[PDB]
Amino acid sequence: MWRIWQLFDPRQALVGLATFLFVLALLIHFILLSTERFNWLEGASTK
Amino acid sequence: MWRIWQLFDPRQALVGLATFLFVLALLIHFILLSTERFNWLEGAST
Amino acid sequence: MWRIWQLFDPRQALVGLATFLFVLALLIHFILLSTERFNWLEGASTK
Amino acid sequence: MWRIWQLFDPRQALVGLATFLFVLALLIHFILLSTERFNWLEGASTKP
Amino acid sequence: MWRIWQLFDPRQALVGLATFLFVLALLIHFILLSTERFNWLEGASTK
Amino acid sequence: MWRIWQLFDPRQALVGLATFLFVLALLIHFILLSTERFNWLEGASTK
Amino acid sequence: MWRIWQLFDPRQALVGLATFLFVLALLIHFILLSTERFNWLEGAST
Amino acid sequence: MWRIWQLFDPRQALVGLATFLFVLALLIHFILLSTERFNWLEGAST
Amino acid sequence: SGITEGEAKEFHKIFTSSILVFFGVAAFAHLLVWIWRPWVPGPNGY
Amino acid sequence: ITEGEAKEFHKIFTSSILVFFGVAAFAHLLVWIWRPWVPGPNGY
Amino acid sequence: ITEGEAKEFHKIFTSSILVFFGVAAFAHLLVWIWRPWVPGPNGY
Amino acid sequence: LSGITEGEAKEFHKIFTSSILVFFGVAAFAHLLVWIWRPWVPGPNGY
Amino acid sequence: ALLSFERKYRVRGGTLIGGDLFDFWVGPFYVGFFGVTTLLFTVLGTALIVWGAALGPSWTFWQISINPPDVSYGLAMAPMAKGGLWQIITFSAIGAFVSWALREVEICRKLGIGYHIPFAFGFAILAYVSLVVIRPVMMGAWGYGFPYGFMTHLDWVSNTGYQYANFHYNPAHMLGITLFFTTCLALALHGSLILSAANPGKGEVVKGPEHENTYFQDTIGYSVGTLGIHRVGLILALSAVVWSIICMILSGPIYTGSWPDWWLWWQKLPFWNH
Amino acid sequence: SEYQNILTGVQVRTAPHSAPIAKGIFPRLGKPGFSYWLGKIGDAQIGPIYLGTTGVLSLVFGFFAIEIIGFNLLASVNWSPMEFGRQFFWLGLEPPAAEYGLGFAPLAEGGWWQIAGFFLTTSILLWWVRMYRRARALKMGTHTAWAFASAIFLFLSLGFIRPLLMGNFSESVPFGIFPHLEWTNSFSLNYGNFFYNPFHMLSIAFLYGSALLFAMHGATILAVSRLGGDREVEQITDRGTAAERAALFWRWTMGFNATMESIHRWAWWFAVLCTFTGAIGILLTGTVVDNWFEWGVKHGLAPAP
Amino acid sequence: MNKGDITGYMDVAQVVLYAFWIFFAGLIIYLRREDRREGYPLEDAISGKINSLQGLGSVFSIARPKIFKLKTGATYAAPNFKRDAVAIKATRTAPTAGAPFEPTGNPMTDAVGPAAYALRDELPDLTLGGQPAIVPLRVAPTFSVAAEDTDPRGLPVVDRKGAVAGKVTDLWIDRASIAIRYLEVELAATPGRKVLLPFAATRINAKTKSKTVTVQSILARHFANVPTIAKTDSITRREEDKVMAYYSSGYLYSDRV
Ligand SMILES: CCCCCCCCCCCCCC(=O)OC[C@H](COP(=O)(O)OCC(O)COP(=O)(O)OC[C@@H](COC(=O)CCCCCCCCCCCCC)OC(=O)CCCCCCCCCCCCC)OC(=O)CCCCCCCCCCCCC
Ligand code: 07D
Ligand code: 07D
Ligand code: 07D
Ligand SMILES: CC[C@H]1c2cc3[nH]c4c(c3C)C(=O)[C@H](C(=O)OC)c4c3nc(cc4[nH]c(cc(n2)[C@@H]1C)c(C(C)=O)c4C)[C@@H](C)[C@@H]3CCC(=O)OC/C=C(\C)CCC[C@H](C)CCC[C@H](C)CCCC(C)C
Ligand SMILES: CC[C@H]1c2cc3[nH]c4c(c3C)C(=O)[C@H](C(=O)OC)c4c3nc(cc4[nH]c(cc(n2)[C@@H]1C)c(C(C)=O)c4C)[C@@H](C)[C@@H]3CCC(=O)OC/C=C(\C)CCC[C@H](C)CCC[C@H](C)CCCC(C)C
Ligand SMILES: COC1=C(OC)C(=O)C(C/C=C(\C)CC/C=C(\C)CC/C=C(\C)CC/C=C(\C)CC/C=C(\C)CC/C=C(\C)CC/C=C(\C)CC/C=C(\C)CC/C=C(\C)CCC=C(C)C)=C(C)C1=O
Ligand SMILES: COC1=C(OC)C(=O)C(C/C=C(\C)CC/C=C(\C)CC/C=C(\C)CC/C=C(\C)CC/C=C(\C)CC/C=C(\C)CC/C=C(\C)CC/C=C(\C)CC/C=C(\C)CCC=C(C)C)=C(C)C1=O
Ligand SMILES: CCCCCCCC/C=C/CCCCCCCC(=O)O[C@H](COC(=O)CCCCCCCCCCCCCCC)COP(=O)(O)OC[C@@H](O)CO
Ligand SMILES: COC(C)(C)C/C=C/C(C)=C/C=C/C(C)=C/C=C/C(C)=C/C=C\C=C(C)\C=C\C=C(C)\C=C\C=C(C)\C=C\CC(C)(C)OC
Ligand SMILES: [Cl-]
Ligand SMILES: [Fe+3]
């Protein structure tokens, strides 16, 4: 699998991956905040 | 069928394929969240 | 029949077919989701 | 009438004809879906 | 009559003619579908 | 993993971190100010 | 930590700091003025 | 701290500083004129 | 304007066989659709 | 494109389309067994 | 990128992604213990 | 790829390691004090 | 830092005022005296907007709104808390935009190019000045200016349009719209043609003026050519703005009724007024 | 005053000529003319136009659509030429009412609108194929057709794709001057003020941005036109002082700049995104958002009413 | 009402809007990459070493060279990474990076500031037919001035102070774009000297019967120093740049020089 780093420059790969993973993580935290059950800051009951 | 990689550049293929697969996956998860039965976050009863 | 590939570029043909077939398939799945009988996600009864 | 290929370019003929036939077929299927009797997906009764 | 094909290019004639006749045929079928008596798909009664 | 500085210019990494961390921190403080429970300036009761 | 000035030009750094710190300070004073408790110019009771 | 003039031209710095201080002074006087307690020209009672 | 006779004849064989297959499938499709629901109404309609 | 490689493409193309149609045909069969899509006289 | 550099990068990458996924798995386990996200038949 | 030597990379990495540990140490102290003031994981009845 | 060709152009001179004192760069930016006055007005007006946000009911960016004085003030200066803030921001914004235009002139002088850009930007300034100064002055109150707020300026557009029953019927507004749509059409065509000539496709050589002219002759029977399209594209954008200004100077200062009812002159023309 | 290069003072003439293309069924039609006033703004040559099979098809379909509209408009004033002129802007051909769904309505009750709409749609899509194929014939990129596809996407969204999602044509656009304006007014009011539709806000930003970019770019190229800047593709393939000074004016003004090629990508994308974001805003209206002001209140655009 | 909802608060229109913001950010990155196909990397203003303030987006900042294929069979790369020499015939007024340069000698002949030009190809622009595009009417007999217009030939050439520089002796026309690009002026001083005058640096004044080509850019003394061209019937892109830059410098320097 190490051959992938000859197809792609590791510098571009790491910055691209870090950008992708941050935006994905940020989306998931905002999605949870949009729910009642998982918004930890407002903290509704599990009725 | 390995000859397909003589038709298409493997580097461009993987970029396009990963872009396609991510957007497709993201679409499918949002479609399921739009449903009553399969929205796991709101979790309606069956 | 193979002379069709002397008439048309195999690479363009595959790109064209893949685009066409995906867009067609996606259209048909969305059409079925609009129907009551075949919307598998909503799953209405055959009353 | 093989001389029609002596009259028109077969490559542009096939591209045009394949496109025409798809558009025509898609139109007819859409027209039928727009009717009670022939919309197979909603499948109304003939009311016998 | 054959002298017409030295006055006009047979390809330009057939393209113009085929274009005209398809558009006219399509117009007539759509007109009949836009009527009660002749819309064969809706199939109203001869009251 | 000091080898990461053989990939990346340390100056660019510091500029990138300082930019990212400030905006992330500023986002989090603004999110908390939007809540009742954690808006320290308005200071609602833990009802 | 003095090695930071071999990475960053002091002249550029001081201009950046002065601008950033002023904008930040001005933001914080305006935030407090928008509050009931900390607006010193309105001076609501506690 | 006199070394600051080996980083910034006195003429440019003085005009920039004078410009900054004037904007800051105007801003504060306009802020006070927006208040009840400190609008000296309206002169509300305390 | 078009192709020389030999390759016109070559094309015409592959064309003629393809169009006859296409029409043959279409005729079978129309027959089955007619057996399911005919599309010429009677005097009283359908 | 040469004749010999055009014949090579045609063989793999023919193999691929038969697999594609084979999977699609099985997909349609399972959907039909679940819910058929040609209604009777009374509809569904 | 030389083969020797690619193999060295892959070694560090493999170690790093497994640490990242290990920490994420621990975060998910704690969140599950707090509030699970797969609802039963009665919902939540 | 960054054009700095192994020596400069190792020198930077030492300062970087100390700086990020200090930054994360202050942040951990900040989070502990906020948790003591108002914790941010709600119970089943909410807050 | 500098571009690979920049240094040879960074010569002294071309300032309108202030001489050498301001004739320098901060990174990529040229300063000049109008750079300084740009910053003066920009910081003042921006901080006064943020002050208005602190005074107002919400920090939600979309909802922040600094409002002109009540029409009852007429053209008097209002108290700061009662619309005077909007008045100071307005004239600071004028100062900032005028300074920006004059700073562009200095940059044109230094580069030996014509003054078309600050001239064209002068129509943006005139449109803003028309909405916040000229129209409210002719209507006799500052309260007809638009409020400075992300959604509230759109609310003002809505309120102002429906005040004349239906603003689509304003004839100058129709012509303004036509020129805005035509500008976007022409820009789409112009961007496309240059890119299609520079990027003919793999294995193709870059095309030139003859091909560029031939594409629009083949498609639509005319080509304006490479110089004409920049003249046209400029004139279209500037004319769209001029007719926008006219449509607003008509609505309120001059014509006060329903715009749908204005068109009834057409149906009353004697050759068809049956 | 220096020469501002707004109008060509002295203009030259030569034998009309154009780039070669492969022989088709139809030659380039018309005798090339020249007009003096077009030669002041731009090139003087009212050149020949290419027809071709796709051109025949598009014009035939489009002519039939225009006749169906025009005949219906004149019929609606009982054929009177005086009342036609008197009422022209107010005349329109309306889509069918909602009870017809997507089937063929009776001719007088919107069936003619459906036929006209279909024929106009087909003509426009054939014109897209024309814009595409004329570029390939000249061995040029297809950028113009793909820009045109964005305009078509809005046109199709307005006329057909949203009706398909809504299940009927009743809120489709009438063919008529004031009627299509009245449709625009009523559509906004029925869905709770289009100012609160964020994709309409995006579409406006790109509409304003297009006029901004063309004012900036048109003024820029004229500012460097005494340095050869109007010869843009030549400047793209061999950077002259005109392209250097255009870049530096903007860099020194606003801190950043394009190239002579890339400014045309900024231009292309802004005009495209105007109609693309427009089309999305239309397709979301009534299908997933029924009142945009209420959506705006939910998402913080306005205080709760 | 539930119609659009994705979660309690989240809905389809909001999701589609953030999908647009993700796309638009990616598009700006693409557009800024294209903007960097000329002039980059950035350099230190004083030393000319490759330096600028950069974040981690530097790694995506500059694109791989695209190759333009020219109809001569030559190519142009973008970025080509060629850059101007660090030394110029001018010196800074102050030692700071942001300071302006003062010309060492005559800036119009030293080609600094608005007299500066790009080192374009020493090749003429070509017609589609492969002939040189820009040529004197003497060599383009099928071209003519439109009968409605004043022909510039034989008119006096006059500066903004009313001094005669010379007379127009030919028009140079662009065969590809069909326009006048230069006037060929025989000078009044050193008679027989001919110089090119960019046509967009002129207008014809015809308020008085002896109509004349007025030139706002430079004074009559400066015409003797207009850059020369190697051939009598064609002009390279570099020679075009050199000539046009010289006149563009007149608005700043002609009352200095
Ligand atoms: C005081 C008043 C301040 C009013 C508000 C002003 C806001 C903008 C800030 C303006 C000042 C920035 C100054 C700066 O960055 O200088 C860098 C330079 C050292 O740099 P360097 O060594 O030369 O290297 C730089 C180079 O490597 C960077 O790369 P590159 O050369 O390729 O690109 C240059 C950058 C420069 O950008 C700018 O200067 C700001 C650009 C304008 C931003 C406007 C944002 C708001 C509008 C909406 C945004 C929208 C974003 C999407 O180029 C860019 O980044 C260009 C990006 C363009 C994106 C265009 C998108 C258009 C979309 C339109 C909307 C469509 C809607 C559908 O500095 C020095 O040399 C040292 C001395 C100066 C220190 C500056 C300290 C900070 C000053 C901050 C001023 C106060 C701000 C509140
Ligand atoms: C995404 C991978 C990578 C990643 C590590 C990174 C991160 C960040 N960058 Mg960036 N960026 C990367 C790559 C890259 N980058 C830029 C540019 C710019 C300029 C102007 C463009 C602009 O409008 O951005 C638009 C958004 C885009 C292009 C996406 C990245 C930025 C985001 C998500 C932050 C947006 C949030 C803000 C509060 C507003 C920031 C300030 C302004 C826009 C003035 C602007 C100052 C800017 C800001 C930041 C910040 C605040 C961060 C944080 C939070 O980490 N970025 C472009 C430019 O011209 O640079 C001189 C350009 O070429 C280019 C490239 C290739
Ligand atoms: C219920 C509402 C009703 C409805 C029926 C309707 C509909 C439509 N209309 Mg309208 N309109 C209505 C009312 C109404 N209508 C207008 C105007 C128009 C113009 C706008 C452009 C323009 O003017 O730009 C004028 C340009 C200006 C004012 C330039 C301003 C910018 C400047 C100085 C620079 C500012 C710079 C900074 C602050 C720097 C910031 C910092 C940094 C970036 C770093 C245009 C022609 C136009 C278009 C359409 C369309 C396409 C439609 C459709 C499709 O239905 N309309 C405005 C005008 O004419 O203003 C002079 C005006 O006021 C007004 C009113 C009240
Ligand atoms: C009471 C009115 C209300 C109010 C709140 C408001 C106000 C304003 N709005 Mg708006 N608008 C309202 C309603 C509303 N608004 C829009 C749209 C926009 C976009 C159009 C972009 C475009 O290029 O259109 C124009 C392009 C089109 C329509 C597509 C391309 C055209 C094609 C392919 C047709 C080709 C033609 C032929 C081949 C000829 C055939 C011949 C014959 C038929 C005889 C644009 C940006 C825009 C501007 C503004 C401004 C400036 C204002 C101001 C200042 O107030 N508005 C459309 C859309 O995209 O919405 C998302 C749309 O549907 C819709 C609606 C219903
Ligand atoms: C006249 C034809 C078009 C045009 C042309 C044009 N605009 C131009 C130019 C040109 C030729 C420039 O050279 C100049 C420029 O530098 O472009 C990058 C500019 C410009 N056009 C701009 C914007 C702009 N142009 C617009 C319109 C148009 N510009 C027309 C359609 C619009 C619209 C319609 O909405 C906008 C937003 C800027 C990007 C820029 C001018 C930058 C400038 O002036 O900078 C100095 C000032 C500041 C940095 C900020 C000052 C802040 C003030 C103190 C407060 C302002 C508050 C404001 C009154 C209210 C805001 C609230 C809103 C929600 C209403
Ligand atoms: C990106 C968004 C912008 C955009 C872009 C755009 N528009 C475009 C393009 C592009 C890139 C094109 O390539 C295309 C074009 O050709 O431009 C020159 C087009 C176009 N944009 C158009 C219009 C248009 N664009 C608009 C807007 C926009 N266009 C947006 C602002 C608008 C509005 C309302 O804002 C309009 C009205 C057209 C001029 C053109 C597409 C022309 C077309 O499709 O024509 C189809 C054919 C007809 C209408 C039929 C005409 C029939 C004749 C009367 C026939 C007469 C002779 C015949 C021989 C008679 C035969 C009789 C027999 C059959 C009996
Ligand atoms: C590198 O450089 C480049 C060039 O060179 C190499 C170029 O060349 C071009 C190309 C650009 C041009 C040739 C000129 C661009 C100019 C404008 C957009 C501004 C003025 C408008 C136009 C020229 C019209 C554009 C559209 C055209 C030419 C039609 C295209 C379509 C067809 C030929 C077929 C279908 C359409 C037809 C037949 C007609 C369409 C309708 C009109 C043109 C409008 C007619 C008017 C009305 C209907 C009346 C409306 C008004 C009314 C009722 C009230 C007022 C009354 C009036 C009479 C007005 C570009 C982009 C370029 O990059
Ligand atoms: C031939 O093809 C062409 C190209 O090229 C080849 C091009 O490129 C372009 C240009 C087009 C593009 C690149 C496409 C993209 C553009 C758009 C879509 C248009 C929209 C534009 C934007 C969104 C960008 C908006 C940004 C703006 C307006 C700039 C904002 C910046 C400022 C206000 C700062 C200005 C700086 C000044 C005046 C001086 C320097 C100051 C600083 C750097 C910072 C502040 C100051 C200090 C730190 C210190 C100094 C302060 C002093 C002295 C005062 C102190 C006192 C105070 C009160 C502050 C075109 C047209 C073209 O046709
Ligand atoms: C780590 C520990 C500390 C040690 C290190 C400390 C010292 C180093 C710090 C540097 C950061 C500060 C300088 C930032 C500018 C540096 C240059 C820059 O552009 O950086 C980007 C951030 O820009 C910027 O935020 C510039 C922002 C300028 C404008 C700021 C306005 C703020 C005020 C209004 C806000 C509200 C507005 C309204 C919102 C609704 C991030 O990189 P990025 O790769 O994308 O660059 C693109 C380039 O790499 C492409 O070639
Ligand atoms: C012969 O002499 C002349 C030319 C003078 C005759 C006179 C002509 C005149 C005066 C014509 C006047 C025309 C006018 C005034 C037109 C105005 C048009 C305007 C302003 C239109 C604006 C917008 C319209 C839109 C966006 C409509 C779009 C409609 C679409 C896309 C509809 C598509 C429908 C389809 C595909 C239907 C499908 C259903 C089928 C047919 C399959 O089944 C029922
Ligand atoms: Cl002029
Ligand atoms: Fe251009």
Author numbering:
A (entry chain F), C (entry chain D), E (entry chain 6), F (entry chain G): 1 to 47
B (entry chain E), G (entry chain J), H (entry chain N): 1 to 46
D (entry chain 8): 1 to 48
I (entry chain 9): 10 to 55
J (entry chain I), K (entry chain O): 12 to 55
L (entry chain Q): 9 to 55
M (entry chain L): 2 to 275
N (entry chain M): 2 to 306
What does the paper say about this structure?
Reaction centre-light harvesting complex 1 (RC–LH1) complexes are the central functional units of photosynthesis in purple phototrophic bacteria. Solar energy absorbed by a circular LH1 assembly migrates to an enclosed membrane-bound RC, where a succession of charge separation and protonation events produces a quinol that leaves the RC–LH1 complex, carrying protons and electrons to a cytochrome (cyt) bc1 complex. The LH1 complex is formed from an oligomeric assembly of transmembrane αβ heterodimers, which bind bacteriochlorophyll (BChl) and carotenoid pigments and curve round the central RC complex. In other RC–LH1 complexes the RC is fully encircled by LH1 and there is no obvious entry and exit point for quinone traffic.
LH1α His29 and LH1β His39 supply the ligands (2.6 and 2.5 Å, respectively) for binding a pair of opposing, excitonically coupled BChls. Here, the structure of the RC–LH1 complex shows that the spirilloxanthins in the LH1 ring are in the all-trans configuration, making contacts with the N-terminal helical region (α3-RIWQLF) of the n − 1 α-polypeptide and the transmembrane region (α26-LLIHFILL) of the n + 1 α-polypeptide. Surprisingly, we identified an extra BChl aGG, localized between the second LH1αβ subunit and the RC special pair. This pigment is not bound to a protein, and instead it is coordinated by an oxygen within the headgroup of a neighboring phosphatidylglycerol molecule. The function of this BChl aGG pigment, unique in currently determined RC–LH1 structures, is unknown. Figure 3 displays the distances to neighboring pigments, showing that the extra BChl aGG is located approximately midway between the BChl aGG pair attached to LH1αβ(2) and the RC special pair of BChl aGG pigments, a distance of 42.6 Å, with its macrocycle tilted ∼60° from the special pair. Four quinone molecules were identified: QA, QB and Qp are assigned as ubiquinone-10, based on their well-resolved densities. The head group of the QP quinone in the Rsp. rubrum LH1 makes lone pair π interactions with the backbone oxygen of RC-L Leu 76, and the isoprenyl tail makes contacts with LH1α4 and 5.
